[PDB]
């Protein structure tokens, strides 16, 4: 099979500036008929892929003028004249010359913006869940930047690593921030063996961790 390679797993860019993404094929994509069968696709978070450029440099219907493509044989480039925050997503190249048709691994465009401290909210188990014998403590760490953050759970001061479920949103297409959800899953019995539950978040925006907590006995 023809192997499509997209070296960069991601590429950081600031809104307003130009950027380019590369793709390489293991075999020339030039067909006997003179055409080069290489296409570019965009896949926004939670959406299906969509055609951006076909046959190296032809912009598809509805694709913004800021996109352009170049290349030949085995080296191709996708270019943005002015990147916008809404451009977040994964960009893939695909060869449409031989079967099996194959795709590159994709390059995620990451938007650079100003640092933003997370808005941290902690939630005690709901009364409904408790009646059901469960006790999940939820912590939301919303709209922060950069993307990396560390979350630690403390029960009566002691750290807890097991029973923690974490999930992260893709970069926001409007404000370019990231959000995270962390859930400490305990049984009602366990929950009642302690009183202080803390969601401790460490982010580059502060030397001291952002602490949110509550007491069960309250």
């Amino acid at each position: 099979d023809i192997v499509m390679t997209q070296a960069a797993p991601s590429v950081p860019v600031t809104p307003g500036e130009s950027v380019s993404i590369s793709c390489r094929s293991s075999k020339s994509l030039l067909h006997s008929n003179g055409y080069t069968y290489l296409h570019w696709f965009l896949q926004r978070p939670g959406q299906s892929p969509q055609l951006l450029i076909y046959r190296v440099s032809n912009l598809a219907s509805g694709v913004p003028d800021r996109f352009s493509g170049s290349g030949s044989g085995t080296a191709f480039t996708l270019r943005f004249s002015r990147v916008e925050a809404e451009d977040v997503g994964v960009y893939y190249c695909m060869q449409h010359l031989e079967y099996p048709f194959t795709f590159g691994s994709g390059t995620k465009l990451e938007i650079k913006r100003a640092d933003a401290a997370p808005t941290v909210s902690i939630f005690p188990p709901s009364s409904e869940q408790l009646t059901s014998g469960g006790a999940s403590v939820v912590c939301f760490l919303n709209n922060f930047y950069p993307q990396d953050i560390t979350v630690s759970w403390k029960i009566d001061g002691a750290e807890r690593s097991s029973g923690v479920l974490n999930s992260w949103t893709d970069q926001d297409s409007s404000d370019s921030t990231y959000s995270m959800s962390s859930t400490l899953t305990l049984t009602k019995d366990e929950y009642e063996r302690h009183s202080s539950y803390t969601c401790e978040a460490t982010h580059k925006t502060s030397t001291s961790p952002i602490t949110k907590s509550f007491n069960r006995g309250e």
Binding site: S48, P49, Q50, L51, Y54, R55, N58, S61, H96
Partner: peptide, 11 residues
């Protein structure tokens, strides 16, 4: 008229 995979469903 070609244009590679021009249309996609929602999945």
């Amino acid at each position: 008229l070609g244009r590679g995979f021009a249309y996609w469903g929602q999945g």
